[PDB]
Structure 1
């Protein structure tokens, strides 16, 4: 069992492992496209010679609070053959990729987790939260105060308006923490999933506004449910207008969307309760590779005074942290630590999705100063609510 970068001959063996490992495996055509986002030496394989282990990272651009875009290593296609479990192959592959990511100069790594129990021990913390809202649209009445009391929204074929979706998404991802650049190969892939599959998914439709879109399809088996796969809105007007159109799908009983906890949809209706939360789960996970680089890169709340502390990350360094005027300075120190946490915990705070005082309550984050806790809570909070871009 040696650990190597895969040659062109290794990829059929990797696709076999993928097929047997991932029930949602996108198949070798789509896999070969996503592959274009993997840099030279971005992938590792373990051979026995068939492929019994693999992992790779993609070059991503992640928006963080203060509309700052970070180079991000996006982990994906991680798999150990069922024949080689509990043999330390994951530990080995994760260690080599983290070495390579660190040496390449990425301040953060990110992934989507298949189980919530695997990734904490490698320094990844859940950084965004997925909310499923299901609206019973038969009772849905808009509030007097809701914007848009002619319709600016058009029902369209997704493939005929690619440029407009690209332009809107590009605006969206640049101003939203959790936003990812979507390169051209992923627009190629997204608009191929929009066509109907014989015995599979139904045709996708689009609702297009100047400042937003929604892609939706009727569910395979429940023909009274519309699944909104993606709603990107750059103004409140766009968001409301798109939801007026979705509530107008009179052949449907229910509209479902995977969104964020701060989605304003419930407040657009006369009955907040009609927008039921049917599902909640961790979205994007972050590993802070370089603590000082990441802490200095993001903006902080202007609505908190200048304050200084010493942060210790468990086997990750000790740092003098000074926050003021929505900037941070983060420098080496051996001064006594005022706040202790494992690396994963820092990942979870980084995008504002979790409160420091909540992680303190579970003792994932030790300090003896209540005042420092409130200051961290306020400073790390994001004015624009954190959202999840797309699964990778």
Structure 2
């Protein structure tokens, strides 16, 4: 077993491992479009020869609180052959890619986890929360207060309005923590999946507003369920107008969407309970590669007064952290730690999805000052709720 950057010759062995590892694997042509986002030296393989392990990262741009955009290494396509389990292949592949990612100057790495038990030990913390809402649209009535009581929304074919979707998404990704730049190859892929497949997905339709769009398709087996694959709204008016149109799908019983915990939809209805939470899971995981670069790069809440503390990340350094006027300064120190946590915990705090107080109650974050805990909670809170852009 040796660990190497793959040559062109390795890619069929990687596609075989992929097919056998990932049921969602569309196939070589689709993976060749995601390959464009992978830099030179972005991939490792383990050969025994034949490919028994692989892992890569893609070049991404991730929006963090304060509308700051970070270069982000997106780990993906990670697989160990079922023949080579418990041989330390994952550990060796993650250590090598992390070395390259850190040396390349990325302040943050990110991934979507296939199981919740794997990535904590490599320093990844769950940083966004997926929340499925299912609306029984037969009972749904809009509240007297809800905006937009002509329609500004049009029912359209997605492929005929690519430009408008691209422009609305670009505005949304820059203003929302969790937003990711979507490269044009990923618009190619998205619009190809919109098409219906024999024995596969049904055709996707779009609802298009000047300041938002919703992409939806009827479920293959449940013909009374419409699944919203993506709703991007830049204004509250756009969000309400799009939900008025979705609730107008009179041939459906139910509309489902994978959204975020602060989605205002339930509050648009006279019965908030009609927007049922049917599923809840971790979305984007973060590994802070460079603690000072990450902490200094994001914006903090202006509401909390200036405060100074000493933060120790387990095997990640100790820092004098001063937060004031929405900005952090984070410098080396050997002064006594006032706060300690593993690297994964910092990733979970970083976008505002998890409260320092919640993590402290599990002893994942350790402090003897409850006042400092309240200050951390308030300062790391995000004004714009954190959302999940697209899986990678």
Specify if TM > 0.5. Answer: yes
How far does residue 7 in structure 1 lie from its aligned partner after superposition? 0.2
Q: Within 5 Å, give how 1:208-223 maps onto structure 2.
A: 208-223=208-223
Question: 1:40 and 2:44 equivalent?
Answer: no
Structure 1 residue runs of 5 or longer lacking an equivalent are none
Deviations along 1:233-269, one digit per CA (max 9) or x if unpaired, are 0000000000000000000000000000000000000
**1-structure distance, mates of 2:168, 2:202:** 25
Deviations along 1:258-315, one digit per CA (max 9) or x if unpaired, are 0000000000000000000000000000000000000000000000000000000000
How far does residue 149 in structure 1 lie from its aligned partner after superposition? 1.2
Aligned-partner SS, 1:191 = helix
**2-structure distance, mates of 1:27, 1:327:** 45
**2-structure distance, mates of 1:27, 1:134:** 31
Deviations along 1:69-116, one digit per CA (max 9) or x if unpaired, are 000000000000000000000000000000000000000000000000
Aligned-partner SS, 2:178 = coil
Aligned-partner SS, 1:328 = strand
How far does residue 26 in structure 1 lie from its aligned partner after superposition? 1.9
How far does residue 386 in structure 1 lie from its aligned partner after superposition? 0.1
Deviations along 1:342-388, one digit per CA (max 9) or x if unpaired, are 00000000000000000000000000000000000000000000000
Aligned-partner SS, 2:69 = strand
Match of 1:16 in 2: 16
Structure 2 residue runs of 5 or longer lacking an equivalent are none
Q: Within 5 Å, give how 1:1-392 maps onto structure 2.
A: 1-392=1-392
**2-structure distance, mates of 1:272, 1:32:** 44
Aligned-partner SS, 1:39 = coil
Deviations along 1:313-348, one digit per CA (max 9) or x if unpaired, are 000000000000000000000000000000000000
Deviations along 1:109-151, one digit per CA (max 9) or x if unpaired, are 0000000000000000000000000000000000000000100
Aligned-partner SS, 2:169 = helix
**2-structure distance, mates of 1:267, 1:92:** 48
Aligned-partner SS, 2:176 = coil
TM-score by length of 1: 1.00
**2-structure distance, mates of 1:7, 1:26:** 22
How far does residue 214 in structure 1 lie from its aligned partner after superposition? 0.2
The alignment of Structure 1 onto Structure 2 pairs a total of residues equal to 392
Aligned-partner SS, 1:37 = coil
**2-structure distance, mates of 1:15, 1:279:** 31
**2-structure distance, mates of 1:110, 1:195:** 29
Aligned-partner SS, 1:301 = coil
